[PDB]
Amino acid sequence: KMKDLSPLMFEDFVKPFQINPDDEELLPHKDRVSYQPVDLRAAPLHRS
Amino acid sequence: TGIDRFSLRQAVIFICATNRPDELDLEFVRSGRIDRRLYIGLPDAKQR
Amino acid sequence: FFTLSYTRGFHLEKKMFHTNGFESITMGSSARDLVALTNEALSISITQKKSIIDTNTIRSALHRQTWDLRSQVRSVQDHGILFYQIGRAVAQNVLISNCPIDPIS
Amino acid sequence: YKEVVLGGDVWDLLDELMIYMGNPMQYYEKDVAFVRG
Amino acid sequence: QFKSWIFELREIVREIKNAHYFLDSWTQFNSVGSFIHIFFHQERFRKLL
Amino acid sequence: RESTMPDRFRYLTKEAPDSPIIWPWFVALGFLVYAWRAVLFELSNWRKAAFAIL
């Protein structure tokens, strides 16, 4: 029924990131890891 | 047992199977008594 | 392992105990785990009609004990866990020089 | 007789078991053990 | 089925490189062979003295 | 056939042939060169008996 309706297609979510098996090439990085350390603490209050 | 360990009469291969591999004892699956383990799984679409 | 292999007429080849060859790949740090390994290696060398044990025989004997045979074989469809294993193996190789490395597949 | 479910590490497990059965005494003379189980 | 005959033959061969029990002539053969083996080895010769 | 077996070990799953024993033929050669004239005697009798039978 939607074959001849042309819906707004969503993008593919589960397309696998894959390496070429024998294409000799230096595949890049960004240049980092994406992890951010957990450091959330307010400054000490006044009158100390 | 009353028989020489290395003989033609002691050339016996012991095949065993179950449906719960983790239920067996630790001293039965030890190497020397049970050496090779074959894992047979469910078939896929073409075999179906 | 050497004194169990030598007593059956099988002379250890003068490359793994003569160098750091088979020390870095050997495991089974318990008794009754070297007898089975010795028997498997001797069986593999006998099927080749040989009397010496090379590196490949020991590797093939170690692979037949800590690996499970399996039907309906499927590989990884997302390269990206391969990098995880590669990095961990490289780090475990260079940094911890006294620990084994299981094979990557 | 469904032979379709027989493939991968089974045709390599059977070859070892026939190797350890066709002449089981060239291994038993020199005091080495089989795959017992 | 001919392989079973060879199996029995070389299994008997394996048994006669042992001392389970068999005919007396082979036992005398093994005894004189063991005596020759003991006598020829010098490190087995000294411990006899 | 897809398998989970490495390529390096592929030659280790095949039974290599062994050279057959040869010294019975050599002691037979020694024993036949040793008794040549009596062997020729017996072969002469065999040929004469065969030709008498035919």
CB under 8 Å to C76, separation ≥6 — which residues? C82
Q: List the Cα angle E30/E32/E34 in 5-degree steps.
A: 65
**Do the beta carbons of residue C12 and residue C53 sit within 8 Å?**
yes
CA distances from D15 to C54, D5, D11, D22, E26 (A): 22, 17, 6, 10, 40
Residue contact E7–D29, C-beta within 8 A:
no
Q: How far is C91 from chain B (nearest CA, A)?
A: 31
Q: What are phi and psi of B9, to 5 degrees?
A: -75, -10
CA dihedral (F30, F34, F35, F36) positive or negative: positive
> Dihedral of the CA atoms E28, E29, E32, E36 (nearest 10)?
-170
Determined by cryo-EM
C80 half-sphere exposure, CB direction, 13 A CA radius: 7
Taking the C-alpha atoms of residue C69 and residue D12, their distance in angstroms, rounded to an integer, is: 9
Taking the C-alpha atoms of residue E26 and residue E29, their distance in angstroms, rounded to an integer, is: 5
**Two structure tokens written together for F32:** 């036949």
Is F4 touching D (CB cutoff 8 A)?
Answer: yes
Taking the C-alpha atoms of residue A17 and residue A24, their distance in angstroms, rounded to an integer, is: 17
Phi-psi category of residue A6: left, alpha or beta, with phi > 0 → left and psi -120 to 50 → alpha:
left
Taking the C-alpha atoms of residue F13 and residue D32, their distance in angstroms, rounded to an integer, is: 17
CA distances from D8 to B38, B46, C73, D18, E30 (A): 10, 16, 7, 17, 51
Taking the C-alpha atoms of residue E9 and residue F53, their distance in angstroms, rounded to an integer, is: 40
Residue contact C78–A17, C-beta within 8 A:
yes
How many CB pairs lie under 8 A apart between chains B and E? 10
Which residues in chain C touch residue D26, judged by CB atoms under 8 angstroms apart?
46
Taking the C-alpha atoms of residue E47 and residue F50, their distance in angstroms, rounded to an integer, is: 65
- Candidates C65, C68, C60; CA nearest to C22 is C60
Q: How far is C72 from chain B (nearest CA, A)?
A: 7
Q: Which of F2, F13, F15 sits opposite D8 (nearest CB)?
A: F2
Give the experimental resolution in Å.
3.3
Residues 1-49 of E with CB under 8 A from B: 7-8, 11, 14-15, 18, 20
**Do the beta carbons of residue D27 and residue C46 sit within 8 Å?**
yes
**Two structure tokens written together for C84:** 């995880």
Taking the C-alpha atoms of residue C10 and residue C39, their distance in angstroms, rounded to an integer, is: 11
**Do the beta carbons of residue D10 and residue F5 sit within 8 Å?**
no
**Do the beta carbons of residue B5 and residue D27 sit within 8 Å?**
no
**Do the beta carbons of residue B5 and residue C36 sit within 8 Å?**
no
Is C82 touching A (CB cutoff 8 A)?
Answer: yes
CB under 8 Å to D10, separation ≥6 — which residues? B38, B40, C69, C71
Residues 1-30 of D with CB under 8 A from F: 7-9, 11-12, 15-16, 19, 22
**Residue labelled with tokens 């020829």:** E40
- Candidates A39, F10, B4, F53; CA nearest to C60 is F10
**Do the beta carbons of residue C58 and residue F8 sit within 8 Å?**
no
**Do the beta carbons of residue B43 and residue D5 sit within 8 Å?**
yes
Is C16 touching D (CB cutoff 8 A)?
Answer: no
| Most D-contacting residue of E3, E6, E10 (CB-CB within 10 A), to test interface | E10
Taking the C-alpha atoms of residue D37 and residue B9, their distance in angstroms, rounded to an integer, is: 16
Query: B34: how many CB neighbours lie within 10 A of its CB?
Result: 15
Q: Beta-strand (E) ranges in C44-101?
A: 52-53, 69-70
The pairing of beta strand C69-70 with beta strand C11-12: unpaired
Which residue in C has a C-alpha nearest to residue A21's C-alpha?
Answer: C79
Is B28 touching E (CB cutoff 8 A)?
Answer: no
**Two structure tokens written together for C79:** 């390269």
Is B26 touching C (CB cutoff 8 A)?
Answer: no
Taking the C-alpha atoms of residue C12 and residue C6, their distance in angstroms, rounded to an integer, is: 7
CB under 8 Å to F12, separation ≥6 — which residues? C44, C47, C48, C56, C57, C60
CB under 8 Å to B10, separation ≥6 — which residues? B3, B4, D28
Taking the C-alpha atoms of residue F45 and residue F37, their distance in angstroms, rounded to an integer, is: 12
CB under 8 Å to F15, separation ≥6 — which residues? C47, D19, D22
Taking the C-alpha atoms of residue F31 and residue A7, their distance in angstroms, rounded to an integer, is: 98
CA distances from C46 to B23, E30, F17, F30 (A): 36, 28, 11, 33
**Do the beta carbons of residue D31 and residue C8 sit within 8 Å?**
yes
Which residues in chain C touch residue A17, judged by CB atoms under 8 angstroms apart?
78-80
C92 half-sphere exposure, CB direction, 13 A CA radius: 13
Is D25 touching C (CB cutoff 8 A)?
Answer: no
